[PDB]
Ligand binder design. Structure first.
Ligand SMILES: COC(=O)/C(O)=C/C(=O)C1(Cc2ccc(Cl)cc2)CCN(Cc2ccccc2)CC1
Ligand SMILES: [Mn+2]
Ligand SMILES: [Mn+2]
Length: 180
């Protein structure tokens, strides 16, 4: 596994709490990106990670004139354009709901106004995987209608092993326990 080994190499050679912080972060993001690929694979939809809203608009409505609109330059993880509806997908990997609400509020408030003016029928989807129990939670009714079952085989254990090593290595470093 080239990704585990590169994290491992970094956890082995890290000496300072600020570079440790970055490794923690990098882990949680690769754990997010891992779920995105597995999710998109199981549904057989295009995999993307951070698409600029302006780019999403132009794929779905080529004739648009961006300048005539105030488009917030958000980058949702992904989207599905069915031809009559746009599903804005963001991935999450969390035991709690707090990251989902924060993102749901952010995309509902910033993306939906401009999509209504442009006239594109849009829904905000947030798909979360609990990394401990592998259970998925979906916010988005049209998404649940298109994907009633999600047949993923998720295994987050290697990410947890790597971060636990990092947390143990810095268990007596007050500077790091604050940063996390
Ligand atoms: C899970 O959903 C998110 O939280 C998310 O997908 C965020 C991202 O894409 C960024 C990378 C990332 C970080 C941590 C984790 Cl664990 C997973 C992915 C990259 C884009 N970046 C937009 C941004 C940047 C600065 C301030 C405000 C927004 C956010 C982090
Ligand atoms: Mn993202
Ligand atoms: Mn995401």
């Amino acid at each position: 596994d080239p990704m585990y080994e590169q994290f491992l190499q970094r956890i082995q050679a890290v000496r300072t709490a600020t570079v440790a912080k970055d490794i923690s972060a990098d882990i949680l993001e690769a754990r997010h990106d891992y779920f995105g690929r597995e999710l998109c694979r199981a549904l057989d939809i295009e995999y993307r990670n951070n698409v600029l809203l302006d780019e999403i608009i132009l794929d779905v409505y080529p004739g648009v004139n961006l300048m005539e609109y105030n488009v917030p330059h958000v980058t949702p993880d992904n989207y599905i354009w069915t031809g009559d509806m746009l599903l804005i997908l963001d991935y999450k990997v969390s035991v709690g709901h707090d990251s989902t609400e924060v993102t749901y509020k952010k995309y509902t408030t910033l993306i939906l106004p401009v999509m209504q003016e442009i006239g594109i029928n849009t829904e905000i989807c947030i798909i979360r995987a609990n990394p401990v129990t592998n259970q998925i939670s979906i916010v988005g009714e049209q998404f649940k209608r298109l994907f009633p079952t999600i047949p993923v085989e998720l295994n987050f254990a290697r990410f947890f092993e790597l971060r636990k090593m990092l947390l143990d290595k810095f268990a007596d470093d007050e500077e790091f326990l604050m940063m996390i």
